[PDB]
Design an enzyme around this catalytic site. Sequence first.
Site, mmCIF file in Angstrom:
data_model
loop_
_atom_site.group_PDB
_atom_site.id
_atom_site.type_symbol
_atom_site.label_atom_id
_atom_site.label_comp_id
_atom_site.label_asym_id
_atom_site.label_seq_id
_atom_site.Cartn_x
_atom_site.Cartn_y
_atom_site.Cartn_z
ATOM 1 N N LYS A 51 -48.837 20.518 2.362
ATOM 2 C CA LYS A 51 -48.554 21.486 1.290
ATOM 3 C C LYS A 51 -49.195 21.010 -0.018
ATOM 4 O O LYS A 51 -48.992 21.612 -1.063
ATOM 5 C CB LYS A 51 -47.034 21.673 1.101
ATOM 6 C CG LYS A 51 -46.306 22.421 2.230
ATOM 7 N N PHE B 265 -51.804 7.909 4.173
ATOM 8 C CA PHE B 265 -51.532 6.568 4.616
ATOM 9 C C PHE B 265 -50.142 6.532 5.280
ATOM 10 O O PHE B 265 -50.069 6.264 6.483
ATOM 11 C CB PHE B 265 -51.630 5.589 3.446
ATOM 12 C CG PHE B 265 -51.056 4.240 3.730
ATOM 13 C CD1 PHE B 265 -51.253 3.631 4.958
ATOM 14 C CD2 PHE B 265 -50.362 3.560 2.748
ATOM 15 C CE1 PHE B 265 -50.759 2.365 5.204
ATOM 16 C CE2 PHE B 265 -49.843 2.301 2.980
ATOM 17 C CZ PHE B 265 -50.040 1.700 4.212
ATOM 18 N N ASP C 42 -46.351 6.104 9.708
ATOM 19 C CA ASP C 42 -44.996 6.510 9.953
ATOM 20 C C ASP C 42 -44.772 7.075 11.326
ATOM 21 O O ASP C 42 -43.682 6.873 11.909
ATOM 22 C CB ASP C 42 -44.503 7.525 8.946
ATOM 23 C CG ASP C 42 -42.992 7.493 8.828
ATOM 24 O OD1 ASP C 42 -42.333 8.479 9.232
ATOM 25 O OD2 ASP C 42 -42.479 6.436 8.394
ATOM 26 N N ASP D 95 -42.323 5.890 14.030
ATOM 27 C CA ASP D 95 -41.226 6.828 14.376
ATOM 28 C C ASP D 95 -41.417 7.567 15.714
ATOM 29 O O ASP D 95 -40.588 8.407 16.070
ATOM 30 C CB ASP D 95 -40.948 7.824 13.230
ATOM 31 C CG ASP D 95 -40.339 7.145 11.976
ATOM 32 O OD1 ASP D 95 -39.950 5.956 12.031
ATOM 33 O OD2 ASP D 95 -40.243 7.802 10.919
ATOM 34 N N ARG E 10 -47.269 16.829 13.799
ATOM 35 C CA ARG E 10 -47.178 16.769 12.348
ATOM 36 C C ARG E 10 -48.252 17.671 11.756
ATOM 37 O O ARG E 10 -49.412 17.587 12.148
ATOM 38 C CB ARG E 10 -47.359 15.312 11.907
ATOM 39 C CG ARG E 10 -48.145 15.058 10.629
ATOM 40 C CD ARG E 10 -47.231 14.821 9.452
ATOM 41 N NE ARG E 10 -46.322 13.705 9.659
ATOM 42 C CZ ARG E 10 -45.264 13.465 8.889
ATOM 43 N NH1 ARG E 10 -44.999 14.264 7.862
ATOM 44 N NH2 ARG E 10 -44.458 12.429 9.142
ATOM 45 N N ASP F 152 -34.835 1.967 6.096
ATOM 46 C CA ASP F 152 -34.862 2.978 7.170
ATOM 47 C C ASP F 152 -34.610 2.292 8.539
ATOM 48 O O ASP F 152 -33.672 2.636 9.261
ATOM 49 C CB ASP F 152 -36.219 3.726 7.177
ATOM 50 C CG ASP F 152 -36.131 5.143 7.761
ATOM 51 O OD1 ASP F 152 -35.866 6.094 6.997
ATOM 52 O OD2 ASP F 152 -36.377 5.331 8.973
ATOM 53 N N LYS G 112 -37.698 4.864 -0.365
ATOM 54 C CA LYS G 112 -38.604 5.359 0.639
ATOM 55 C C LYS G 112 -39.226 6.695 0.263
ATOM 56 O O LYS G 112 -40.273 7.022 0.797
ATOM 57 C CB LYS G 112 -37.923 5.413 2.012
ATOM 58 C CG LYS G 112 -37.276 6.717 2.364
ATOM 59 C CD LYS G 112 -37.174 6.849 3.869
ATOM 60 C CE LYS G 112 -36.831 8.277 4.234
ATOM 61 N NZ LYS G 112 -36.509 8.408 5.676
ATOM 62 N N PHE H 241 -34.792 16.238 -2.108
ATOM 63 C CA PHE H 241 -35.971 16.430 -1.272
ATOM 64 C C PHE H 241 -35.834 15.823 0.110
ATOM 65 O O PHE H 241 -36.073 16.502 1.107
ATOM 66 C CB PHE H 241 -37.198 15.829 -1.932
ATOM 67 C CG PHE H 241 -38.486 16.157 -1.226
ATOM 68 C CD1 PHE H 241 -39.001 15.304 -0.258
ATOM 69 C CD2 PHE H 241 -39.178 17.319 -1.524
ATOM 70 C CE1 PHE H 241 -40.183 15.602 0.391
ATOM 71 C CE2 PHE H 241 -40.359 17.623 -0.879
ATOM 72 C CZ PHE H 241 -40.867 16.764 0.078
ATOM 73 N N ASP I 254 -35.368 17.230 3.872
ATOM 74 C CA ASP I 254 -36.227 16.795 4.977
ATOM 75 C C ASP I 254 -35.443 16.563 6.256
ATOM 76 O O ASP I 254 -35.825 17.064 7.332
ATOM 77 C CB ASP I 254 -36.994 15.515 4.617
ATOM 78 C CG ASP I 254 -38.096 15.200 5.608
ATOM 79 O OD1 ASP I 254 -39.015 16.031 5.754
ATOM 80 O OD2 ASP I 254 -38.037 14.130 6.243
ATOM 81 N N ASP I 255 -34.354 15.798 6.112
ATOM 82 C CA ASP I 255 -33.393 15.458 7.195
ATOM 83 C C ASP I 255 -32.604 16.661 7.698
ATOM 84 O O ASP I 255 -32.298 16.744 8.884
ATOM 85 C CB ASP I 255 -32.416 14.392 6.704
ATOM 86 C CG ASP I 255 -33.121 13.167 6.185
ATOM 87 O OD1 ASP I 255 -34.277 12.939 6.611
ATOM 88 O OD2 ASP I 255 -32.527 12.447 5.356
HETATM 89 C C1 LIG Z 1 -45.066 2.308 5.942
HETATM 90 C C2 LIG Z 1 -44.432 3.512 5.605
HETATM 91 C C3 LIG Z 1 -43.472 3.518 4.597
HETATM 92 C C4 LIG Z 1 -42.813 4.702 4.229
HETATM 93 C C5 LIG Z 1 -43.084 5.928 4.859
HETATM 94 C C6 LIG Z 1 -42.456 7.065 4.462
HETATM 95 C C7 LIG Z 1 -42.253 8.236 5.117
HETATM 96 C C8 LIG Z 1 -41.600 9.193 4.385
HETATM 97 C C9 LIG Z 1 -41.223 10.460 4.695
HETATM 98 N N1 LIG Z 1 -41.451 10.933 5.919
HETATM 99 C C10 LIG Z 1 -40.319 11.545 6.667
HETATM 100 P P1 LIG Z 1 -40.918 12.630 8.036
HETATM 101 O O1 LIG Z 1 -42.505 12.633 7.796
HETATM 102 O O2 LIG Z 1 -40.405 14.017 7.835
HETATM 103 O O3 LIG Z 1 -40.629 11.947 9.312
HETATM 104 P P2 LIG Z 1 -39.162 10.215 7.349
HETATM 105 O O4 LIG Z 1 -37.832 10.826 7.594
HETATM 106 O O5 LIG Z 1 -39.846 9.480 8.438
HETATM 107 O O6 LIG Z 1 -39.072 9.201 6.135
HETATM 108 N N2 LIG Z 1 -40.577 11.265 3.837
HETATM 109 C C11 LIG Z 1 -40.285 10.813 2.560
HETATM 110 N N3 LIG Z 1 -40.670 9.511 2.229
HETATM 111 C C12 LIG Z 1 -41.310 8.750 3.143
HETATM 112 S S1 LIG Z 1 -41.870 7.220 3.036
HETATM 113 C C13 LIG Z 1 -44.061 5.912 5.867
HETATM 114 C C14 LIG Z 1 -44.724 4.726 6.241
HETATM 115 MG MG LIG Z 2 -41.087 10.149 10.233
HETATM 116 MG MG LIG Z 3 -37.706 12.931 7.902
HETATM 117 MG MG LIG Z 4 -39.322 7.675 8.881
#
Ligand SMILES: Cc1ccc(-c2cc3c(NC(P(=O)(O)O)P(=O)(O)O)ncnc3s2)cc1
Ligand SMILES: [Mg+2]
Ligand SMILES: [Mg+2]
Ligand SMILES: [Mg+2]
Lengths: 343, 343
Positions: free
Chosen positions: B50, B91, B96, B100, B105, B167, B193, B232, B236-237
Amino acid sequence: DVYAQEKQDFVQHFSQIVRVLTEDEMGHPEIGDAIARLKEVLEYNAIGGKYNRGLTVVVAFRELVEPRKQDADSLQRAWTVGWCVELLQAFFLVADDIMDSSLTRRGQICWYQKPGVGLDAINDANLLEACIYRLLKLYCREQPYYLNLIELFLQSSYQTEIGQTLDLLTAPQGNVDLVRFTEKRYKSIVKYKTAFYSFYLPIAAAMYMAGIDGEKEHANAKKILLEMGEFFQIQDDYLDLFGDPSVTGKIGTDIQDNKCSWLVVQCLQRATPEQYQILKENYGQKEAEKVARVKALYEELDLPAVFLQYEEDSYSHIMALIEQYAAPLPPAVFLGLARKIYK
Amino acid sequence: DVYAQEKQDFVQHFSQIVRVLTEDEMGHPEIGDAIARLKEVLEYNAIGGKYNRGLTVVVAFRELVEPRKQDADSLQRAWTVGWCVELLQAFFLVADDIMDSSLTRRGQICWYQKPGVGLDAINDANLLEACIYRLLKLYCREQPYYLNLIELFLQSSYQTEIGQTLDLLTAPQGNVDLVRFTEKRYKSIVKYKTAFYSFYLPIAAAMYMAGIDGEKEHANAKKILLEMGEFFQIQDDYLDLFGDPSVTGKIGTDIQDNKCSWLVVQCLQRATPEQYQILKENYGQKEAEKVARVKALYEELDLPAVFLQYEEDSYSHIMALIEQYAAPLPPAVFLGLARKIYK
Ligand SMILES: Cc1ccc(-c2cc3c(NC(P(=O)(O)O)P(=O)(O)O)ncnc3s2)cc1
Ligand SMILES: [Mg+2]
Ligand SMILES: [Mg+2]
Ligand SMILES: [Mg+2]
Ligand SMILES: Cc1ccc(-c2cc3c(NC(P(=O)(O)O)P(=O)(O)O)ncnc3s2)cc1
Ligand SMILES: [Mg+2]
Ligand SMILES: [Mg+2]
Ligand SMILES: [Mg+2]
């Protein structure tokens, strides 16, 4: 003699690295568990090395300052930046060992292989990366060189990663890639992936810490340190196979990973069309009978004695470059570096 | 209206990002293949978003400069730094998604899941990281802010990684970790995070690009942007489970990965001892019958309407913070940001 001296002194200073990097507890009680894990990373991954690069920064610094300017706080910075290079190293190997599927390193199991870690290794790796610049701001934030180092460490990461991309593009799992294994590719690879960071960086870092930032002085230095750069990896790739794992502290995955090693490169130059075919059937595969048949072929073309040959040839050439190019700098810098890597 | 405007303009400027970042060909023919792969990375991973953060930098910049100072080259820098935030994002998601175990994505398969890529994803990820600072030196090397941005981007990476470590420490594969899921842990998590990088960073970046570097001004800004920050992620969650995958462009792995999500957190506050046990048996596991039984439990405790509740509660509080804290800055900054994230 000279690295042998300040090694122990270099390693005691790792107690304070960890102290400082984890002195945020009562200020931020929330994140204390992340910071513990951080500690655990550093203990496991920054330690066990030959600490050569980190040392190299320190030794170079002494060599390049008038000791009337080597006060307590200058040596504080001196080995701080030392440690930063170790972190950079550590960053690279932790990621490197996932990517290269390695089992062991530094005489113990790889971080990413420990149970309960696995791919959190990736986040761990980038943390070390971060700590580098965390320190810089701590101990060098007010120096005229502070910014040149930051750019150096980054300009060097990028170059390492470019190398690493070549490493891998040249080395796909599955794809017989013997065509790709040319010495032109190879020199490019170890140049970006190894020479810049394991050599140009540490030295260069101290040049800037000694107030020495002329492009031409750095350029000469670079000319010299890229060879040492380069030999160093041909030795790494040699040792990968013919090296002693109680002394390298790791097990080689170059054949298995279809890698563009010095060896396969030389092997190819001296291949009888049939031989090309043996290697063809065997290179780039997990199977031990195949990995074995190749190790035989390298021995069948007396490459270990060829490595002994380049070692002399390169010692001699590296030495010509020091004569041609060290000045205005003290030639003990480069010499000290050569003693410590040649046998 | 306001992001809707300069989005297309923001996205065309990605043709030059890629041009510049890969304009080294005849100078270094050796590494051309690494640079192709680089291109391929950027095309795949920097695009589809986005582009909100990258945009946010640009919009904020206009808002905070007298247009007599918004010359061609200032907007050159303006959206360059925009793109840098996108890279930072990219990055993070590339790493991630390995960490994860995500499948998709942005409406397509994850980079690391493509055949022929796998864990070279890790090296790819750090490359984007690098490009950030590559650009900075390119377009901002001569600005008085150049160094403040570098420190910002890094100080922000670290914080993101600290969050990320929380996390994961809070979310081990295997270990029933319901005890760990407290709202005190959670606020800490999404703070480091998510909040810092998706909000403080972009805004802050432009503050410095507008010559605004007072600690107290940044501090207030921070106070506001950490809430927007925080909501935010609760969104997301929320979306992770109850969101539309043709609109989120991704599939949720929070239950499967034993994650400390807003949901499980609220779920626990409202658990009848038995319920605690249902969730116990089911959370943190790949099995779909289990993941299903949990989604039922969240619906069984009418949490979606609770999320609708916090959404209002938070909109209202975020708005109080803007009133209490925006000035001396133009409140349109924060407002524009809120419109774009609330429903
Ligand atoms: C090494 C490293 C450190 C932090 C991230 C973060 C992923 C992320 C994020 N992605 C989300 P998603 O992309 O919806 O899975 P998450 O629930 O995995 O955190 N959303 C908001 N902040 C962050 S920071 C990703 C990789
Ligand atoms: Mg994730
Ligand atoms: Mg998430
Ligand atoms: Mg994550
Ligand atoms: C992301 C990334 C980028 C570069 C590396 C490097 C590993 C490495 C290195 N390690 C050796 P090894 O540690 O003996 O396997 P390699 O043959 O895998 O390259 N030696 C010299 N330079 C480098 S750079 C590691 C990780
Ligand atoms: Mg390796
Ligand atoms: Mg390697
Ligand atoms: Mg090697």
